[PDB]
Structure formats: structure tokens, C-alpha cells
């Protein structure tokens, strides 16, 4: 039987089959409900919209994300999305297909326990297994050593792994990701008179961020250049035909990744988080981890992010060490590819959690067999 590697993220649901190279279905993880009163007989009959439909009809819907900060908070919507991604997108019958899921480190135990309970009771899957997102991202990169900085819509976590060993005491997490960047962009776009308050307008701002933002090599040099001429200004087209123009806001929005104090967070920037993470590893390992920085995730797709991260870490790292950022072109789908590789290995077949084991111990069993 073929495994269904299904990655659930804060922003996007990446699903597919084991052994493939690319996911087959990628739709945003949103659920939409109407907010205006219908008047036409027939027509509107659905109480909820999921996936691309909720994205297409966003003019008349309120969109809620079931996942925030990588922790599921609305379980009914999550169950709805799981049903959709199995019966209407991959065209499969979960009863005859083992499934693989993903979860960020340092999550509440109840989240994973519930997830196991839902998977074995509302879907009757043959087997399941929850793997750390950063760990899977390393399988796709074809390495056994290196530190992984997986940042997407929910969290930005670092997990160093050396020679098939993960040092858990150096795992760090930060609830600063794409959604926080979108909120900051919405906050600063009001400096130019553009107001976005509704959920659909939040999606529009998110699209602007994806299509116009970039990370500056020198924040100061860039702000000075933007304030000297109009070279950095660009124009974006709203869906109703109005045109907006953004100047320094293009690179101030992703600067929050390097200066979390912009959004009022006391925590350090990602470069300093990575530097602290390696320094908690044993002194004999730091050299290999300096030279295998592997990035993966939607927030890791801002153009120029690799150069800024390399510059900052080299500023922090010792002079004699070599710093090498690895940013593969498919780092948006690194986690899914790594999951497909893991589910397709022969030795991994002894690590599934089957229904017989589930019934004996209960969801709890998931802590024992999964890292």
C-alpha cells in the first residue's frame, strides 16, 4: 500500500503520495463562512467554504485560520480541512492508505494526542506517524549533519542534527513568522493612507508581501537610499483596479525577522537565535554546523534573505570558521519531500503506529514512538 504524506501548516496544506517528487495538492488552510444575508432562492446553500473556494469567494466570507503559531485552536475546521484534502483533492480513501503528518517542536502534547485520536477514530487510517518538520527537511537536502531553520506561516524553529543525532537541548522556537509579517505590513501600510482591516484584505496584503517584499543587505543603507530618490518604489494592482505604491515598506516588513522589536517582541532576531542555538552544542560539533545552514519554508523565500543571514552569522561567528547558507530552490516544499522520502524507506516501516497499538495504549502512545 502507498503512503499519503500530508503536511499541515499554518498557511498552506501540502499533500501528496509517498515516493513522488512534488505535492499533488496545495491549497490554503482557511475556512470561510458567509457574512451577508442571502436573498436568491437556491444559490447559497453551503454553511462553510474550504480551500480555494473560500479564497475565490472571499468577498462575501469571513476567513478563519484553524492553525495559529503552529498549534491547532479550532478542531472542527481542522477536521473539515482533513476531510476535504482526502475526499475532494487527492481522490483517495483514507481507509487503505497510511498517512504521515508533521508538527513543530515544543508544541503542547494535547495537540498531538488529539491529532492521533482524530486520525484513528474519525478517519480509520491504517497507520500514522508524526515527524518533526525540521527533521524531515534534512532528509530532502540529502544530509546527516546541519542546522535547519524552518520558518513558514506559524513558527521559526531551529533544530541542529549531527551524524543522525539530534541535540534536543539546542532546539529553539519563535512565534514570529509570515502571519506576523503580514500583520506588520498591514500596520505600516496605513502610513500611506491604505486601510486593510477585513480578512480578505488581509489576504490581499499577504499577496502584496509575497510579490513585492525583499530583505535588504544593509537596512540603514536601504532606508537612506529609499529616502533619497524614488528608485525603490513599485506599483501593485488591487483587484478592483485601484493602484497602490509602496516605497521603504518593501524591505521594512521582512526586517522584523532580523529586529523583532519592530512588532514589540523582546526576543532576539533569527540570526542571533541561530547563533545561540549552535553555541549550545558541543564544541567539537560547531564547525560542521557553521557550514551547513539549511533553510526551508515560505518565509525563507524572500529574495536576498540568504545573503543577509550569511553576513549576520559571519559577523557573529568566529573569524576562522566558514559559514555556508544552503538555500535550495524548492525549500518551500522541503518538508513534504523529506516526508515522502522517509515514508518510502524500508527501515521506516517498523515505526508506524497501527490500530492495534493505538487501542492498547491510547493516543498517549504517540509520545513514546515519536520524537
Amino acid at each position: 500500500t502507498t503512503a499519503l504524506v500530508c503536511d499541515n501548516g499554518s498557511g498552506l496544506v501540502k499533500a501528496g503520495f509517498a515516493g513522488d517528487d512534488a505535492p499533488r495538492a496545495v491549497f490554503p488552510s482557511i475556512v470561510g463562512r458567509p457574512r451577508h444575508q442571502g436573498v436568491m432562492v437556491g444559490m447559497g446553500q453551503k454553511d462553510s467554504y474550504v480551500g480555494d473556494e473560500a479564497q475565490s469567494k472571499r468577498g462575501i466570507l469571513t476567513l478563519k485560520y484553524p492553525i495559529e503559531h503552529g498549534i491547532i485552536t479550532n478542531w472542527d475546521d481542522m477536521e473539515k480541512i482533513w476531510h476535504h484534502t482526502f475526499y475532494n483533492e487527492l481522490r483517495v480513501a483514507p481507509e487503505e492508505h497510511p498517512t504521515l503528518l508533521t508538527e513543530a517542536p515544543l508544541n503542547p502534547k494535547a495537540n498531538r494526542e488529539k491529532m492521533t485520536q482524530i486520525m484513528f477514530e474519525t478517519f480509520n487510517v491504517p497507520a500514522m506517524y508524526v515527524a518533526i518538520q525540521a527533521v524531515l527537511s534534512l532528509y530532502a537536502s540529502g544530509r546527516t549533519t546541519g542546522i535547519v531553520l524552518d520558518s513558514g506561516d506559524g513558527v521559526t524553529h531551529n533544530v541542529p542534527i549531527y551524524e543522525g543525532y539530534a541535540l534536543p537541548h539546542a532546539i529553539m522556537r519563535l512565534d514570529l513568522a509570515g502571519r506576523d509579517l503580514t500583520d506588520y505590513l498591514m500596520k505600516i501600510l496605513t502610513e500611506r493612507g491604505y486601510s486593510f482591516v477585513t480578512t480578505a484584505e488581509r489576504e490581499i496584503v499577504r499577496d502584496i508581501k509575497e510579490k513585492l517584499c525583499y530583505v535588504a543587505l544593509d537596512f540603514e543603507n536601504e532606508m537612506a537610499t529609499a529616502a533619497s530618490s524614488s528608485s525603490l518604489e513599485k506599483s501593485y494592482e488591487l483587484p478592483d483596479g485601484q493602484v497602490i505604491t509602496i516605497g521603504n515598506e518593501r524591505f521594512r516588513c521582512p526586517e522584523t525577522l532580523f529586529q523583532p522589536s519592530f512588532i514589540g517582541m523582546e526576543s532576539a532576531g533569527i540570526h542571533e537565535t541561530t547563533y545561540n542555538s549552535i553555541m549550545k552544542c558541543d564544541i567539537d560539533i560547531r564547525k560542521d554546523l557553521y557550514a551547513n545552514n539549511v533553510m526551508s519554508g515560505g518565509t525563507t523565500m524572500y529574495p536576498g534573505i540568504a545573503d543577509r543571514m550569511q553576513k549576520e552569522i559571519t559577523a557573529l561567528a568566529p573569524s576562522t570558521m566558514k559559514i555556508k547558507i544552503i538555500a535550495p530552490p524548492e525549500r518551500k516544499y522541503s518538508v513534504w519531500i523529506g516526508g515522502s522520502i522517509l515514508a518510502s524507506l524500508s527501515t521506516f516501516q517498523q515505526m508506524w503506529i497501527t490500530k492495534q497499538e493505538y487501542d492498547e495504549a491510547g493516543p498517549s502512545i504517540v509520545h513514546r514512538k515519536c520524537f
Binding site: 444575508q37 442571502g38 447559497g44 446553500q45 454553511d47 479550532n74 472542527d76 503542547p108
Partner: protein, 172 residues
């Protein structure tokens, strides 16, 4: 029986629909309302796992998510007296609602559905599933009377007023 159950402070606020949709042509008042109470009744992690597992089974048989599950509950509940098992299973759910810390907020939500959407249209011959939930929220049992409405037919204070626009076009 279900001692040690705690709930989130305010988590059902994200389930109530807009007042507008509450006037929509095919708005399901019963199904959505049972959704609001169910999201409120979701146990918090602070509850011990043996206690939490017990309540989740109770919510899985009286306030489900799938449409067919609620449809089957609506069918066999007409002559509910033939199933004594559900009568006790429904009562133990009612006593939990009465002690909900946010009962006052949930009481207002029920009345908002009744006046705007029409949740209490039957005003005494409901499904007996919606009855206990309302009875748990407000114990006086006054929702069966029906929501009082204001009638503009009588007009004690009818005041025909010729404003700016109405004065450009009249008769006699």
C-alpha cells in the same frame, strides 16, 4: 460524575454568525446554535485526561459535527421516551451547562438567535435536543413564550411628516 471539568474563558465568540446572515434565506438556526454551545463545551487541557476522555464521548453522541449524525438524532428523538439511555445521557449534559462559568454570555447568544434568526419559532414543540440546551442556559423556561415583537400596524404615535423631499410631491 464529570468533576474536574474546566473550559476556555472565551472561545465560542468566533462561532456566532453575523446578524445579517442571521436573516439569510437558508440560515440553519438549530445546527449553528448547537455548534456555538459545542465550541463552548470543549474541555480545556487543564482537565485530567481520564476526566477529559469521558466528556468527549458525551459530546460525540449529542452534539456531533457530521450532518448525518445530527439527522439521525433528530429522527429517533421524536418518541424519545422509548430510549431511556439517552434521557440520562442528555440530563448529565444539561447539568454541565448550568454550571458553565460563561453561562450569562451563552444566555445572551441564545436570545440573539431567537429574535434575529428564529431559533424559538416552534415555541414549545422543539426537537428536545434544543430544549435542554436552552433550558440549561436560562432555567426560568421563558423562551417557550416566544420573542416579543413590535407591531407597526397600530401606530399610537403615527406622525405623517412632510420632510424636504416629500414636500415636492403630494396630493390633497
Amino acid at each position: 460524575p464529570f468533576s474536574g471539568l474546566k473550559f476556555k474563558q472565551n472561545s465560542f465568540l468566533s462561532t456566532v454568525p453575523s446578524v445579517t446572515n442571521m436573516h439569510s434565506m437558508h440560515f440553519d438556526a438549530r445546527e449553528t446554535f448547537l455548534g456555538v454551545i459545542r465550541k463552548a463545551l470543549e474541555p480545556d487541557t487543564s482537565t485530567p485526561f481520564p476526566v477529559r476522555r469521558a466528556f468527549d464521548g458525551l459530546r460525540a453522541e449529542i452534539l456531533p459535527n457530521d450532518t448525518i449524525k445530527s439527522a439521525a438524532l433528530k429522527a429517533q428523538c421524536s418518541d424519545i421516551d422509548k430510549h431511556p439511555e439517552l434521557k440520562a445521557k442528555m440530563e448529565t449534559l444539561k447539568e454541565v451547562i448550568t454550571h458553565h462559568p460563561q453561562k450569562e454570555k451563552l444566555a445572551e447568544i441564545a436570545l440573539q438567535f431567537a429574535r434575529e434568526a428564529g431559533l424559538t419559532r416552534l415555541k414549545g414543540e422543539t426537537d428536545y435536543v434544543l430544549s435542554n440546551v436552552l433550558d440549561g442556559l436560562i432555567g426560568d423556561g421563558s423562551w417557550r413564550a416566544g420573542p416579543a415583537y413590535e407591531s407597526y400596524l397600530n401606530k399610537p404615535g403615527v406622525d405623517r411628516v412632510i420632510t424636504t423631499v416629500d414636500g415636492l410631491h403630494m396630493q390633497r
